[PDB]
Amino acid sequence: SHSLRYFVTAVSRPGFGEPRYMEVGYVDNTEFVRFDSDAENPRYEPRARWIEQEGPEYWERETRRAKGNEQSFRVDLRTALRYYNQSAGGSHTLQWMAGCDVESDGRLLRGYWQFAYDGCDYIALNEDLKTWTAADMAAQITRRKWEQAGAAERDRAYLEGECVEWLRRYLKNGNATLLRTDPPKAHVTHHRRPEGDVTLRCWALGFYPADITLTWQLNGEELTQEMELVETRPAGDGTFQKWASVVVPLGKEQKYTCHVEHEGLPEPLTLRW
Amino acid sequence: IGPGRAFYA
Amino acid sequence: MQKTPQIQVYSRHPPENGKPNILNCYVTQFHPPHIEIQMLKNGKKIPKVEMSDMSFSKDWSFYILAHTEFTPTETDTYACRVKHASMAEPKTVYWDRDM
């Protein structure tokens, strides 16, 4: 499936000026648009070549939507202080993430519309797009207000309406990069440790999309508890990389094989030292 | 396009 | 309310002395958003380092990517220095080019 998501952050700067407000847009893991309140001339911007072809009206309206959102966030930052009985001298953060995950037939798989205050969950729209989950007492106030104003109905219209429709358009205009598939180039390194064993690390490089399975196997079995990994890491060029390692006994390396699966790999690779 | 805030906290 | 950044340093291609490459400093799982980063060559700040726009992943923590073109050498050491309110002192992670 694919996804269209918007990540928003507003950081209050008491003692400096207005809250730093920001919006970032992604279709899967590629950022394609951005809005920064601090920029000299705050207006939505392209972060991927394939969105640049959108007309000035697309850009003007998105810039207008982002500013309305900035105001809303400035206001909520003040309300919070009140809800949590906090001082107006400290800096606080308010995050918002909204988006939709959709299958090939364009059917909404999962919708999101959630907030966090100072890094902790505040309130989130439930999977049913009908009810809200409030993390605490302050959030209840908000939940009851939104329950009364029928907020979930309007927000659901976006996730099921515009989110989905614009997602297919983007995937289309940007298929060349967004739907591309780069196989992973792999290899394994060797390191004799001081505990008198060896660490074997399997690298998978320059692949895309992100999804990948890097695994170590011994006697055709997955060493699920012995592996040390690192979450898939990004690169400026849009590709990803990763490694999985395991510690093995001296002179027994040839018993271990690295197994890597990927969209760009007709069949799983199997490497050795 | 992105989401719009239509309700205050 | 305050999370310690995870720092991972790596290059785009397996390193080869004298061959142009790209060094990456990936900083994640931190909070608050404010944070300072620098990539160092022999302990001296590298002038041009591009800094990807801040973001946050599903658990609400911020992450960011710094990178810079470079050409490794048998005698040059690279590192990434991070200053965040969650740490008493800045954490500097060296690039382990043989991992």
Short mmCIF file of C-alpha atoms in Angstrom, two decimals:
data_model
loop_
_atom_site.label_atom_id
_atom_site.label_comp_id
_atom_site.label_asym_id
_atom_site.label_seq_id
_atom_site.Cartn_x
_atom_site.Cartn_y
_atom_site.Cartn_z
CA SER A 1 0.00 0.00 0.00
CA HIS A 2 0.89 3.66 -0.19
CA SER A 3 0.38 6.61 2.05
CA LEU A 4 0.01 10.36 1.97
CA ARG A 5 0.92 11.96 5.28
CA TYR A 6 1.43 15.40 6.73
CA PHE A 7 3.61 16.02 9.77
CA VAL A 8 3.11 19.25 11.60
CA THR A 9 5.00 20.85 14.48
CA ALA A 10 4.56 24.15 16.30
CA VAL A 11 7.22 25.17 18.89
CA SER A 12 6.45 28.18 21.12
CA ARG A 13 9.29 30.64 21.64
CA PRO A 14 8.31 32.85 24.60
CA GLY A 15 10.94 35.57 24.86
CA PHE A 16 11.73 35.48 21.16
CA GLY A 17 8.57 35.82 19.10
CA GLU A 18 5.81 33.80 17.42
CA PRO A 19 5.79 30.00 17.57
CA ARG A 20 7.97 28.27 14.95
CA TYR A 21 5.33 26.50 12.84
CA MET A 22 6.12 23.71 10.39
CA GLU A 23 4.48 21.34 7.93
CA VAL A 24 6.04 18.47 5.94
CA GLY A 25 4.33 16.24 3.38
CA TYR A 26 5.13 12.64 2.39
CA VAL A 27 3.84 10.04 0.00
CA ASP A 28 5.43 7.00 1.63
CA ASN A 29 8.93 8.04 2.75
CA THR A 30 9.58 10.77 0.25
CA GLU A 31 9.11 14.33 1.45
CA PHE A 32 7.53 16.28 -1.41
CA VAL A 33 6.29 19.55 0.13
CA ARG A 34 7.17 21.74 3.09
CA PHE A 35 6.16 24.88 4.95
CA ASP A 36 8.38 26.78 7.39
CA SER A 37 6.97 29.78 9.27
CA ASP A 38 10.50 31.13 9.85
CA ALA A 39 11.36 31.30 6.13
CA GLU A 40 11.76 34.83 4.71
CA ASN A 41 8.58 34.44 2.65
CA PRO A 42 6.48 31.65 4.22
CA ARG A 43 4.76 29.68 1.47
CA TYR A 44 4.36 25.98 0.67
CA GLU A 45 7.31 24.58 -1.31
CA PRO A 46 8.25 21.63 -3.56
CA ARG A 47 10.72 19.08 -2.16
CA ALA A 48 10.42 16.61 -5.01
CA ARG A 49 10.78 17.31 -8.72
CA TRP A 50 7.46 15.69 -9.59
CA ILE A 51 5.32 18.04 -7.52
CA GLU A 52 6.89 21.14 -9.07
CA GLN A 53 4.59 20.81 -12.09
CA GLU A 54 1.55 21.66 -9.95
CA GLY A 55 0.07 25.02 -10.92
CA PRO A 56 0.31 28.31 -8.93
CA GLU A 57 -3.25 27.84 -7.71
CA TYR A 58 -2.25 24.54 -6.09
CA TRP A 59 0.61 26.32 -4.37
CA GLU A 60 -1.36 29.40 -3.33
CA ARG A 61 -4.19 27.43 -1.75
CA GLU A 62 -1.81 25.11 0.11
CA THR A 63 0.03 28.17 1.41
CA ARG A 64 -3.32 29.57 2.51
CA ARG A 65 -4.29 26.33 4.27
CA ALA A 66 -0.92 26.19 6.06
CA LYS A 67 -1.32 29.70 7.44
CA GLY A 68 -4.79 28.98 8.79
CA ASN A 69 -3.29 25.95 10.47
CA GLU A 70 -0.45 28.04 11.92
CA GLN A 71 -2.96 30.38 13.54
CA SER A 72 -4.92 27.46 14.92
CA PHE A 73 -1.72 26.09 16.43
CA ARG A 74 -0.72 29.40 17.99
CA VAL A 75 -4.10 29.43 19.70
CA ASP A 76 -3.95 25.84 20.89
CA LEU A 77 -0.52 26.50 22.40
CA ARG A 78 -2.10 29.10 24.67
CA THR A 79 -5.05 26.89 25.60
CA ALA A 80 -2.63 24.13 26.62
CA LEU A 81 -0.79 26.37 29.08
CA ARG A 82 -4.23 26.86 30.62
CA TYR A 83 -5.25 23.19 30.57
CA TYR A 84 -1.99 22.14 32.19
CA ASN A 85 -1.77 25.23 34.35
CA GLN A 86 1.65 26.02 32.94
CA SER A 87 3.77 29.17 32.97
CA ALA A 88 3.88 31.39 29.89
CA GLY A 89 7.68 31.59 30.03
CA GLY A 90 8.56 28.06 28.91
CA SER A 91 8.75 26.67 25.37
CA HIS A 92 6.30 23.91 24.41
CA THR A 93 5.56 21.72 21.39
CA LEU A 94 2.40 20.57 19.67
CA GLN A 95 2.55 17.90 17.00
CA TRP A 96 -0.01 16.77 14.51
CA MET A 97 0.09 13.90 12.01
CA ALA A 98 -2.71 13.24 9.53
CA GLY A 99 -2.79 11.01 6.48
CA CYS A 100 -4.19 7.92 4.81
CA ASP A 101 -2.84 4.49 3.88
CA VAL A 102 -4.46 3.13 0.70
CA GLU A 103 -4.49 -0.13 -1.28
CA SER A 104 -4.14 -0.44 -5.07
CA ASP A 105 -7.89 -0.26 -5.76
CA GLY A 106 -7.83 3.10 -4.01
CA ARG A 107 -9.74 1.82 -0.98
CA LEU A 108 -8.82 3.63 2.27
CA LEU A 109 -6.87 1.17 4.40
CA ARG A 110 -6.12 3.37 7.40
CA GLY A 111 -6.73 7.01 8.27
CA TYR A 112 -4.77 9.10 10.81
CA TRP A 113 -5.47 12.40 12.60
CA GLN A 114 -3.55 12.67 15.85
CA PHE A 115 -1.86 15.09 18.22
CA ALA A 116 0.81 15.14 20.90
CA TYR A 117 1.71 17.85 23.42
CA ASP A 118 5.31 18.26 24.56
CA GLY A 119 6.01 14.83 23.04
CA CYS A 120 3.26 12.78 24.68
CA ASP A 121 0.03 11.63 23.09
CA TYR A 122 -2.74 14.15 23.54
CA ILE A 123 -5.73 13.09 21.42
CA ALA A 124 -6.14 10.79 18.37
CA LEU A 125 -8.92 9.91 15.96
CA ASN A 126 -9.67 6.19 16.22
CA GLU A 127 -9.38 3.69 13.37
CA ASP A 128 -13.18 3.98 12.95
CA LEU A 129 -12.79 7.67 12.06
CA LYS A 130 -15.77 8.22 14.34
CA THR A 131 -14.38 8.32 17.90
CA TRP A 132 -11.48 9.98 19.77
CA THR A 133 -8.95 8.70 22.30
CA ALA A 134 -7.79 11.27 24.88
CA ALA A 135 -4.46 10.53 26.56
CA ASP A 136 -5.35 12.52 29.68
CA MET A 137 -7.72 14.85 31.52
CA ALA A 138 -6.70 17.91 29.52
CA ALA A 139 -7.41 16.00 26.31
CA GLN A 140 -10.91 15.02 27.55
CA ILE A 141 -11.94 18.63 27.57
CA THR A 142 -10.86 18.70 23.96
CA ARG A 143 -12.53 15.38 23.20
CA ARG A 144 -15.86 16.52 24.64
CA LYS A 145 -15.68 19.77 22.68
CA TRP A 146 -14.91 18.00 19.41
CA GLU A 147 -17.53 15.39 20.18
CA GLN A 148 -20.07 18.22 20.47
CA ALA A 149 -18.96 20.15 17.39
CA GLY A 150 -19.01 16.98 15.29
CA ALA A 151 -15.32 17.31 14.40
CA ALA A 152 -14.70 13.63 13.54
CA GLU A 153 -17.26 13.83 10.75
CA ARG A 154 -15.52 16.69 8.97
CA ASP A 155 -12.02 15.26 9.53
CA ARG A 156 -13.16 11.88 8.18
CA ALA A 157 -14.29 13.62 4.98
CA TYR A 158 -10.67 14.63 4.35
CA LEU A 159 -9.07 11.25 5.05
CA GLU A 160 -11.63 9.48 2.86
CA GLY A 161 -12.02 12.29 0.38
CA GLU A 162 -9.10 14.50 -0.58
CA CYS A 163 -6.34 12.39 1.02
CA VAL A 164 -7.16 9.31 -1.04
CA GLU A 165 -7.89 11.10 -4.32
CA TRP A 166 -4.78 13.29 -4.25
CA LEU A 167 -2.69 10.27 -3.27
CA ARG A 168 -3.35 8.47 -6.57
CA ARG A 169 -2.68 11.66 -8.50
CA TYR A 170 0.74 12.05 -6.82
CA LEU A 171 1.68 8.38 -7.26
CA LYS A 172 0.86 8.94 -10.90
CA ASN A 173 2.71 12.19 -11.54
CA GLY A 174 5.69 10.80 -9.62
CA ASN A 175 5.65 7.13 -10.58
CA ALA A 176 9.17 7.35 -12.04
CA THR A 177 10.73 7.88 -8.60
CA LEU A 178 7.95 6.92 -6.18
CA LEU A 179 7.21 3.54 -7.76
CA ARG A 180 10.78 2.77 -8.81
CA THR A 181 12.50 -0.29 -7.33
CA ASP A 182 16.28 -0.50 -6.76
CA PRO A 183 17.67 -3.91 -5.75
CA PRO A 184 19.96 -3.93 -2.69
CA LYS A 185 23.71 -4.42 -3.18
CA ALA A 186 24.84 -6.66 -0.34
CA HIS A 187 28.01 -8.01 1.24
CA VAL A 188 29.27 -9.28 4.57
CA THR A 189 32.13 -8.05 6.79
CA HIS A 190 34.27 -9.90 9.34
CA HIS A 191 35.57 -8.82 12.77
CA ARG A 192 37.36 -10.90 15.39
CA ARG A 193 36.17 -9.75 18.81
CA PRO A 194 38.06 -9.68 22.12
CA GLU A 195 35.69 -12.18 23.75
CA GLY A 196 37.40 -14.58 21.36
CA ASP A 197 34.66 -14.82 18.77
CA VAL A 198 33.69 -13.19 15.47
CA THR A 199 31.00 -10.71 14.50
CA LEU A 200 29.66 -11.12 10.98
CA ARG A 201 27.79 -8.13 9.64
CA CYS A 202 25.56 -8.29 6.59
CA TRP A 203 25.12 -5.00 4.74
CA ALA A 204 22.34 -4.17 2.29
CA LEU A 205 22.93 -0.94 0.42
CA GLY A 206 21.34 1.54 -1.99
CA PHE A 207 17.95 -0.17 -2.19
CA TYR A 208 14.44 1.23 -2.61
CA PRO A 209 11.74 1.14 -1.40
CA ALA A 210 12.47 0.82 2.32
CA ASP A 211 10.89 -2.57 3.05
CA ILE A 212 13.56 -5.24 3.34
CA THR A 213 14.36 -8.46 5.17
CA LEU A 214 17.96 -8.96 6.31
CA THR A 215 18.44 -12.15 8.23
CA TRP A 216 21.11 -14.50 9.50
CA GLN A 217 20.58 -18.25 9.29
CA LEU A 218 22.38 -21.33 10.63
CA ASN A 219 21.36 -24.82 9.58
CA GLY A 220 18.43 -23.35 7.69
CA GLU A 221 17.06 -21.65 10.81
CA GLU A 222 16.51 -17.96 11.66
CA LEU A 223 18.78 -16.61 14.45
CA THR A 224 16.05 -14.26 15.66
CA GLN A 225 17.41 -13.78 19.20
CA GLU A 226 21.11 -13.54 18.32
CA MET A 227 20.86 -10.75 15.77
CA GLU A 228 21.81 -7.13 16.32
CA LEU A 229 20.31 -4.72 13.80
CA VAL A 230 19.92 -1.04 13.10
CA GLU A 231 16.68 0.38 11.73
CA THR A 232 16.67 1.14 8.01
CA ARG A 233 18.66 4.37 7.51
CA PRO A 234 18.07 6.96 4.76
CA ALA A 235 20.38 8.71 2.29
CA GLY A 236 20.26 12.03 0.45
CA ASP A 237 19.58 10.25 -2.84
CA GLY A 238 16.39 8.63 -1.61
CA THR A 239 17.82 5.10 -1.23
CA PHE A 240 18.14 3.14 2.03
CA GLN A 241 20.66 0.85 3.70
CA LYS A 242 20.95 -1.48 6.68
CA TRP A 243 22.87 -4.18 8.46
CA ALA A 244 22.26 -7.24 10.66
CA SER A 245 25.03 -8.94 12.56
CA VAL A 246 25.58 -12.01 14.67
CA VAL A 247 28.51 -13.25 16.74
CA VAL A 248 29.84 -16.68 15.76
CA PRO A 249 32.47 -19.15 17.11
CA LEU A 250 36.03 -19.21 15.76
CA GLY A 251 36.50 -21.16 12.54
CA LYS A 252 32.78 -21.70 12.03
CA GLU A 253 31.82 -18.76 9.80
CA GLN A 254 31.07 -20.93 6.75
CA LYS A 255 28.09 -22.33 8.63
CA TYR A 256 26.32 -18.98 8.60
CA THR A 257 24.48 -17.37 5.71
CA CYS A 258 22.90 -13.98 5.26
CA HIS A 259 19.43 -13.98 3.75
CA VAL A 260 18.03 -10.81 2.14
CA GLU A 261 14.60 -10.32 0.57
CA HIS A 262 13.49 -7.29 -1.41
CA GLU A 263 10.97 -6.11 -3.98
CA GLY A 264 13.89 -5.67 -6.38
CA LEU A 265 15.09 -9.23 -5.82
CA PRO A 266 13.35 -11.91 -7.95
CA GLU A 267 14.56 -14.42 -5.39
CA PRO A 268 16.12 -13.97 -1.94
CA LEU A 269 19.90 -13.59 -2.00
CA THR A 270 22.04 -15.72 0.24
CA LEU A 271 25.54 -14.52 1.03
CA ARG A 272 28.41 -15.87 3.11
CA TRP A 273 31.78 -14.62 4.31
CA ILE B 1 -3.28 18.33 -0.47
CA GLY B 2 -2.86 18.60 3.29
CA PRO B 3 -5.32 18.67 6.23
CA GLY B 4 -7.02 21.72 7.64
CA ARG B 5 -7.68 22.67 11.27
CA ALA B 6 -11.33 23.61 11.79
CA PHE B 7 -11.66 23.09 15.54
CA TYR B 8 -9.66 24.58 18.43
CA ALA B 9 -8.26 22.43 21.26
CA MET C 1 9.41 15.29 27.90
CA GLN C 2 13.06 14.72 27.08
CA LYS C 3 14.58 12.03 24.89
CA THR C 4 18.25 11.27 24.17
CA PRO C 5 19.27 11.24 20.50
CA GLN C 6 20.56 8.11 18.80
CA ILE C 7 23.49 8.89 16.54
CA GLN C 8 24.48 6.73 13.57
CA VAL C 9 27.29 7.67 11.16
CA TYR C 10 27.77 5.95 7.78
CA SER C 11 28.62 6.49 4.10
CA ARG C 12 26.58 5.95 0.92
CA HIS C 13 29.12 3.49 -0.54
CA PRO C 14 31.63 1.05 0.91
CA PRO C 15 34.70 3.33 1.44
CA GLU C 16 37.73 3.37 -0.84
CA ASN C 17 40.70 5.60 0.03
CA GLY C 18 40.81 8.36 -2.53
CA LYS C 19 37.31 7.91 -3.91
CA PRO C 20 34.68 10.40 -3.45
CA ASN C 21 31.75 9.37 -1.29
CA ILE C 22 29.04 10.79 0.96
CA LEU C 23 29.08 10.75 4.77
CA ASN C 24 25.82 10.63 6.67
CA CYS C 25 24.92 11.58 10.20
CA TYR C 26 21.50 10.23 11.12
CA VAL C 27 20.11 11.49 14.44
CA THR C 28 16.89 10.05 15.82
CA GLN C 29 14.55 9.49 18.74
CA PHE C 30 15.15 12.84 20.37
CA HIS C 31 12.97 15.47 22.01
CA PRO C 32 12.58 18.44 22.22
CA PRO C 33 13.11 19.35 18.53
CA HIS C 34 15.86 21.85 19.22
CA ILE C 35 19.26 20.25 18.53
CA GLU C 36 22.68 21.19 17.13
CA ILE C 37 24.76 19.11 14.74
CA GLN C 38 28.16 19.24 13.04
CA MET C 39 30.18 16.77 11.02
CA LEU C 40 33.86 16.82 11.87
CA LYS C 41 36.98 16.04 9.85
CA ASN C 42 40.03 15.58 12.09
CA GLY C 43 38.09 17.38 14.80
CA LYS C 44 37.54 20.45 12.61
CA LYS C 45 34.01 21.41 11.51
CA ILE C 46 33.16 20.59 7.91
CA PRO C 47 32.00 23.84 6.20
CA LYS C 48 29.30 22.58 3.86
CA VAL C 49 26.94 20.02 5.37
CA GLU C 50 23.35 19.80 4.13
CA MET C 51 20.73 19.33 6.85
CA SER C 52 17.50 17.59 5.86
CA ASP C 53 14.33 19.22 7.22
CA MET C 54 13.27 18.11 10.70
CA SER C 55 10.64 15.42 11.04
CA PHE C 56 9.08 13.13 13.58
CA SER C 57 8.20 9.45 13.37
CA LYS C 58 5.11 7.67 14.69
CA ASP C 59 6.24 7.49 18.31
CA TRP C 60 6.38 11.32 18.16
CA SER C 61 10.18 11.62 18.42
CA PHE C 62 12.19 13.83 16.10
CA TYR C 63 14.85 12.67 13.64
CA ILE C 64 17.12 14.42 11.12
CA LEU C 65 19.74 13.70 8.45
CA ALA C 66 23.00 15.55 7.84
CA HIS C 67 25.35 14.64 5.00
CA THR C 68 28.35 15.94 3.09
CA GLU C 69 30.47 14.82 0.15
CA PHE C 70 33.87 13.52 1.20
CA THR C 71 36.82 11.40 0.15
CA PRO C 72 38.15 9.07 2.88
CA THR C 73 41.84 8.61 3.49
CA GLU C 74 44.09 6.26 5.40
CA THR C 75 44.86 9.20 7.65
CA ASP C 76 41.56 11.09 8.02
CA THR C 77 38.98 10.47 10.75
CA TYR C 78 35.36 11.62 10.54
CA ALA C 79 32.78 12.20 13.27
CA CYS C 80 29.40 13.72 14.08
CA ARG C 81 28.91 16.00 17.07
CA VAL C 82 25.48 16.50 18.64
CA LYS C 83 24.33 18.98 21.30
CA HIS C 84 20.90 18.37 22.80
CA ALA C 85 19.25 19.52 26.05
CA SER C 86 18.92 15.88 27.07
CA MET C 87 22.67 15.48 27.43
CA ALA C 88 25.05 17.19 29.83
CA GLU C 89 27.78 17.27 27.23
CA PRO C 90 27.73 17.05 23.42
CA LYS C 91 28.03 13.50 22.12
CA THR C 92 30.49 12.90 19.32
CA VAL C 93 30.28 9.63 17.43
CA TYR C 94 33.17 8.68 15.19
CA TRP C 95 32.68 7.02 11.83
CA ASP C 96 33.81 3.38 12.12
CA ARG C 97 34.85 2.73 8.54
CA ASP C 98 35.34 -1.02 8.84
CA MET C 99 32.03 -2.17 10.31
#
